[PDB]
Amino acid sequence: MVLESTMVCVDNSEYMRNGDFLPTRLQAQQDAVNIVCHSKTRSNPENNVGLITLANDCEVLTTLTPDTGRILSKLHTVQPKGKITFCTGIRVAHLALKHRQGKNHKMRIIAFVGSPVEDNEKDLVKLAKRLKKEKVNVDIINFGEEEVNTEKLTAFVNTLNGKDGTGSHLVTVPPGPSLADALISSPILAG
Amino acid sequence: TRPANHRQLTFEEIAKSAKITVNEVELLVMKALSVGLVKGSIDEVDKRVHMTWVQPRVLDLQQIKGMKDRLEFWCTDVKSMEMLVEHQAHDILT
Amino acid sequence: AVQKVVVHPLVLLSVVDHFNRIGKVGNQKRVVGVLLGSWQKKVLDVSNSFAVPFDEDDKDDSVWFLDHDYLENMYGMFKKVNARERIVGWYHTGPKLHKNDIAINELMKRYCPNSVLVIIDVKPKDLGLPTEAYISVEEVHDDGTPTSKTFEHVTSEIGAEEAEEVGVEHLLRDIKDTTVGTLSQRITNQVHGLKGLNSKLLDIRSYLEKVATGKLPINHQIIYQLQDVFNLLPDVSLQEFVKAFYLKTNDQMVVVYLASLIRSVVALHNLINNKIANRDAEKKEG
Amino acid sequence: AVDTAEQVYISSLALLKMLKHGRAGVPMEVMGLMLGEFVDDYTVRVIDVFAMPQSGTGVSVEAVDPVFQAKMLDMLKQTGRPEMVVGWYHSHPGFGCWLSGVDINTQQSFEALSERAVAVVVDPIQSVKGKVVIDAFRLINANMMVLGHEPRQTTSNLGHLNKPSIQALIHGLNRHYYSITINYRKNELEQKMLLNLHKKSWMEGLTLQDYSEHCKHNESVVKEMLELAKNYNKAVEEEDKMTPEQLAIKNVGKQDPKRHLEEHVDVLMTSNIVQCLAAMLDTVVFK
Amino acid sequence: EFLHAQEEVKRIQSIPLVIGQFLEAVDQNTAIVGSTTGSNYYVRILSTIDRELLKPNASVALHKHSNALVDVLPPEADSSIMMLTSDQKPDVMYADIGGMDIQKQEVREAVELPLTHFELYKQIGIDPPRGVLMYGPPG
Amino acid sequence: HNMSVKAMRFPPKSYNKDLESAEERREREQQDLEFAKEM
Amino acid sequence: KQYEKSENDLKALQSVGQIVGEVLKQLTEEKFIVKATNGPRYVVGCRRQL
Ligand SMILES: [Zn+2]
C-alpha cells in the first residue's frame, strides 16, 4: 500500500511515574500505542513499528520490527525514571529513520512528551528547520503533567508545518487524568 | 639525587645526612629493603651499599627538560647506529 | 585475563570489502561490525565477522544505532551454518579511536563477557602491524572518580591457518622474501626492528609536547615508568661487561672459524669431482 | 551462442570463503550460494559467496531453502548493496573436478532459472600453494549431442589452453558440459595489506636467544659433527673405485657425510652470526 | 621461479594414501615395492625423499591410483605394542619361584647380562647367544 | 672457498638436450588414456 | 500419516554405507593410519570435530 514506517517515541521520562492517570500512565500510553499500531498495522501491512525514547538514555528498546509483542514486553516494566532529554530526541529519531530498510517509505514519527522540557527554542528551531529541509511530518502528543500551554512545542510544530507543510499537529495534554485513548482519538482518525 | 654513574653511598654519609649513629643505619636500611621502597645490596667491610632501584617519585615541569635532553641524543644514537645498518647492509636486500 | 588475539586474513579482508560497499557515502562513516570467533586456553581467536548498518551525525556525537534484528537474525544464521562459530566481540574501522567506542562495548557487552573491539586500517601504511585490539577495564583510582572504563591494548598478531595459507599464498604469487639464511633476520629485525624502536622512541617525544603548551594533565601516572626507563638504562662499558663480552665473542668466533674452515674443503672436494668430470670427458667424447 | 572465451573474473575474498567452508566440513560435499555481479554474454563476475547449512547426515549437494536464501538474500540488501545470484558451488573433497549425476541435476534446476548460472567445483585438499583447482563448468546440451552438432563455436584462441584432467575425461567433461577459463581480480589495496600483515617479527631479533644455551647448543652440534667428519674420513677412501653411479645406487641405506656435513656447517653459521651481531647492536643503542 | 615449483610437486602426497613396503631399487630413482594389497609393483619415486632413509623393509607410502612412491614412514607394528609397563607387569617376584637356581641364574646369564654388561662379551669376545629355547613337561 | 667456487666453472659443458619425457610415449599415453576414459 | 510414514523412505534411501576399520596409530593431529577388515593398510584423516 502506501509506503511509510511507523515509529513511535515512547516516554520513559521521570514525569510519567505515578498512577494518577487512571490505571497507570504507562498502561494508558501503552494501550494507546497498541490500538494505534492496530490501526496502522491493520490499515497498511507494510509497516514495521519500533520504539525509541527521549530520556537521558535514548535506548533502542525495540529494534524496528513488524511485531508489537516485543513492544508489549519492553513497555511492561519499562522503568520510566529518567531525566528527559528531548534535544537528542530529534537526532535519535531521524537518524534511526535514516537507518531504515526503505527510505522510499514516508518518514512518520509520533512523539510522547509528558514532561517539562528544558530545550532551547533556538535548538529546536534549528532541528525544526532541519526537518523543514528533511520533509518529515510529526504529530507530537502530550501526556502527564507538563509546563502547561506547552512551552516551545507550539513554536516547534509551528516551525514544522510551515512552508506549505500544514499537515502536522500538536496534541497538547488536557491536564485531567482520564483514559488517554480518547485523548489520542484525533490523530488516529486524521493526522 | 645520585646519578647512574655511581648511586653508591656510605654509612658515614648516612650518619652525616641523617645524624644517626653507626650501629643503627644497618637496621634502618634493612628495614628499607624489607619494606621494599629501595632495592640494593649491603657491603659491611667497605661501609658502602649498592643501591640499585628506588621508589619512583613525582616531579615538576623542570625535570621533563632533563628527560627531554636525555631523550634527545638517545634518538640520534639509534639514528647513528642504524645508518651503518642501512648503508652497509644495503646490497644484501634492496 | 586475555593473553593475546589471533586475527585471520579472511576477517581482515572482510572489513575491507564492506568498507568498499559503503564507500559511496564519501563524507564520514566508521565500519562498525560484529566480531565472531572463539577463545581457548585464554587465547583469543577471530575467524569470521560481518558489519552492522551504522550511521552517526557529527552534531551531538553520542547518537549511535545498532540494528539488533540484523544482529540476531544473521548471527542465528551463522550459528545455524556453524554451531562451533560464535560471538567474540566487535570491531570498528578505527582511524583514531572514535568517541562512541566507550559505550558501543557497553551497548553490546550483554553478548560477550570480554566484548573485545578491533581497530583496523583502511589506508595501509606503517612500519609495523596496523592491527589493534583493546580490552574494557574499569578501575577506580585516587585521582579521578568511579566510572573508569578505559581501554587497554591487549597485544595482537595475525594468526595463520592451514586452510587459509594455501589460498592466501596463492593470492600473492608476487614477491616473497624467503630463502632464510641470515638475511631474513638482518632485514625483518636488524633493519626493520630498529625503526620499530624509532617510533616508540618518537611517541614519548610526542607526549613531551606538554612542557608549557600542551594539555592540562601534567604527570601523575606517566613519570614512574619513564623514571623506570632512565633508572633502567643498562650498564656502561667499563666494569665487567667488557670482559665476559670478549670472553663469549672469543668463544663464538671459534665455531665460526671451524665452519668457515670446513666449507672451503667441501668446495675443494667438489672441484676434484669436477676435474674428474672434465679430464675423462674431453678425451672420451673428443 | 557462446564463443568458448568466457573468462570468469571472480574476486579475492570468495576463494577464501570457498576454502574455509569447503575445508571445515571436509568429508561431506558441502556447498553454498554465489552472489555476484552479472555482466555480458562474454564475461561474468562473482564478488561474494555465502554458504548454506546442511540438510542432514550424508554426502550430497542436496537442496536449497529459499526461505534461507530469501531472508539471507534480504540480509545484506538492507545493509550493503544488492547483487545478483550468478552461480553456486559444491566441494569434491579428494576427487578432482567434474559433475556427478547428483551435481548435474541440481545444476539443471539452477540453469532453468537463469541460463548463466555457474557450476563451481573447488577441491581444497589437492591444493598446496599454487593450486586451487577451481575448474568451474556448466552443462552442454545432450539434445545437441543427439544432434551430433559440435557446440560452442570457437572464435578465439582462449579456450583450448589448459589441458583437461583424465578423471574429468572419465566423467562428463566434454559430453555433458564444458570448461571455463578464469583469472583473479587483484588491486593494489589488498596486496599490500596482506603482504605487510602476514609474518612480521615484532622485536625478536633484538633479543639474545638463551645466552647460556646458544654456545651450549653450538657444542651440541660440533660434538657429533666430529664423528660425522670421521665419516668424511671414511667416504672419500672408496673413490677411484667402482663407477660412481654405483656410489649413487649404493648409498641408499646409510648416510653420507657430505650433505649431512654441509647442513651442519650452515646451521652453525647462521646460528652464530645472527646472535653475534644482535648481541652487539644493543651495546651501542642501549647506552 | 624454481622455489615455486619446488613445493608444487606435493599435491600427490595429500590424504588418500595407501601403504606398501620397499623391497629394492633397480637403479637411481626407480624402485620396486610390495603392496599391502599383496601384489608387487614396479614403481617410480618422489625426488625430494632422502634416499638414505631406505633399504631394509621400509614401510613406504604409495599413491592410490598412479602407484608410485610418496613418503617413508616411521615404524609401526601390530597389537604387541611394547607391553605398556603400567598395568602390564605379571606381578611376579623372583622369590616367588623356589628351587630354580640353575635355570634362573642361567637365564640371568643368558638374557639380561649381555643386555647390560655387553662390553665383556665384546671384549673377551665369547659370541653372546642370539635366541634361547626352553622346554620340558608342562607346569 | 669463493675461489674454489669461481674456479669450479670450467666443467659445465655438453648439457644439450633436456628431454621432458618423450613424444611418441606421450601420444600412446593419450591413446591409452583415451581408451581408459572411453571405458 | 500414509504420506509421512512412506516419506521416511524418500530421504532414507540416501545413506551410503561405511567401511568398518581399525586404528593402528596416530602420526600427527590429522595423519592417521588404519587397516580395514579387508586388506591393505591406509593413511587417513578425521573430521575436525570428532
Ligand atoms: Zn560433486
From Swiss-Prot, chain B:
<feature type="modified residue" description="N6-acetyllysine">
    <location>
        <position position="16"/>
    </location>
</feature>
<protein>
    <recommendedName>
        <fullName>26S proteasome non-ATPase regulatory subunit 13</fullName>
    </recommendedName>
</protein>
<comment type="function">
    <text>Component of the 26S proteasome, a multiprotein complex involved in the ATP-dependent degradation of ubiquitinated proteins. This complex plays a key role in the maintenance of protein homeostasis by removing misfolded or damaged proteins, which could impair cellular functions, and by removing proteins whose functions are no longer required. Therefore, the proteasome participates in numerous cellular processes, including cell cycle progression, apoptosis, or DNA damage repair.</text>
</comment>
<comment type="subunit">
    <text>Component of the 19S proteasome regulatory particle complex. The 26S proteasome consists of a 20S core particle (CP) and two 19S regulatory subunits (RP). The regulatory particle is made of a lid composed of 9 subunits including PSMD13, a base containing 6 ATPases and few additional components.</text>
</comment>
<comment type="similarity">
    <text>Belongs to the proteasome subunit S11 family.</text>
</comment>
UniProtKB/Swiss-Prot annotation, chain C:
<dbReference type="GO" id="GO:0042803">
    <property type="term" value="F:protein homodimerization activity"/>
</dbReference>
<dbReference type="InterPro" id="IPR037518">
    <property type="entry name" value="MPN"/>
</dbReference>
<dbReference type="GO" id="GO:0043161">
    <property type="term" value="P:proteasome-mediated ubiquitin-dependent protein catabolic process"/>
</dbReference>
<keyword id="KW-1017">Isopeptide bond</keyword>
<feature type="modified residue" description="N6-acetyllysine">
    <location>
        <position position="210"/>
    </location>
</feature>
<dbReference type="GO" id="GO:0005829">
    <property type="term" value="C:cytosol"/>
</dbReference>
<dbReference type="InterPro" id="IPR033858">
    <property type="entry name" value="MPN_RPN7_8"/>
</dbReference>
<dbReference type="GO" id="GO:0005634">
    <property type="term" value="C:nucleus"/>
</dbReference>
<keyword id="KW-0647">Proteasome</keyword>
<dbReference type="InterPro" id="IPR000555">
    <property type="entry name" value="JAMM/MPN+_dom"/>
</dbReference>
<comment type="function">
    <text>Component of the 26S proteasome, a multiprotein complex involved in the ATP-dependent degradation of ubiquitinated proteins. This complex plays a key role in the maintenance of protein homeostasis by removing misfolded or damaged proteins, which could impair cellular functions, and by removing proteins whose functions are no longer required. Therefore, the proteasome participates in numerous cellular processes, including cell cycle progression, apoptosis, or DNA damage repair.</text>
</comment>
<feature type="cross-link" description="Glycyl lysine isopeptide (Lys-Gly) (interchain with G-Cter in ubiquitin)">
    <location>
        <position position="176"/>
    </location>
</feature>
Swiss-Prot record, chain E:
<comment type="function">
    <text>Component of the 26S proteasome, a multiprotein complex involved in the ATP-dependent degradation of ubiquitinated proteins. This complex plays a key role in the maintenance of protein homeostasis by removing misfolded or damaged proteins, which could impair cellular functions, and by removing proteins whose functions are no longer required. Therefore, the proteasome participates in numerous cellular processes, including cell cycle progression, apoptosis, or DNA damage repair.</text>
</comment>
<comment type="similarity">
    <text>Belongs to the AAA ATPase family.</text>
</comment>
<comment type="subunit">
    <text>Component of the 19S proteasome regulatory particle complex. The 26S proteasome consists of a 20S core particle (CP) and two 19S regulatory subunits (RP). The regulatory particle is made of a lid composed of 9 subunits, a base containing 6 ATPases including PSMC4 and few additional components. Interacts with NR1I3. Interacts with PAAF1. Interacts with TRIM5. Interacts with ZFAND1.</text>
</comment>
<protein>
    <recommendedName>
        <fullName>26S proteasome regulatory subunit 6B</fullName>
    </recommendedName>
</protein>
UniProtKB/Swiss-Prot annotation, chain F:
<comment type="similarity">
    <text>Belongs to the proteasome subunit S3 family.</text>
</comment>
<feature type="region of interest" description="Disordered">
    <location>
        <begin position="14"/>
        <end position="39"/>
    </location>
</feature>
<protein>
    <recommendedName>
        <fullName>26S proteasome non-ATPase regulatory subunit 3</fullName>
    </recommendedName>
</protein>
<comment type="subunit">
    <text>Component of the 19S proteasome regulatory particle complex. The 26S proteasome consists of a 20S core particle (CP) and two 19S regulatory subunits (RP). The regulatory particle is made of a lid composed of 9 subunits including PSMD3, a base containing 6 ATPases and few additional components. Interacts with UBQLN1 (via ubiquitin-like domain). Interacts with ERCC6.</text>
</comment>
<feature type="compositionally biased region" description="Basic and acidic residues">
    <location>
        <begin position="15"/>
        <end position="39"/>
    </location>
</feature>
<comment type="function">
    <text>Component of the 26S proteasome, a multiprotein complex involved in the ATP-dependent degradation of ubiquitinated proteins. This complex plays a key role in the maintenance of protein homeostasis by removing misfolded or damaged proteins, which could impair cellular functions, and by removing proteins whose functions are no longer required. Therefore, the proteasome participates in numerous cellular processes, including cell cycle progression, apoptosis, or DNA damage repair.</text>
</comment>
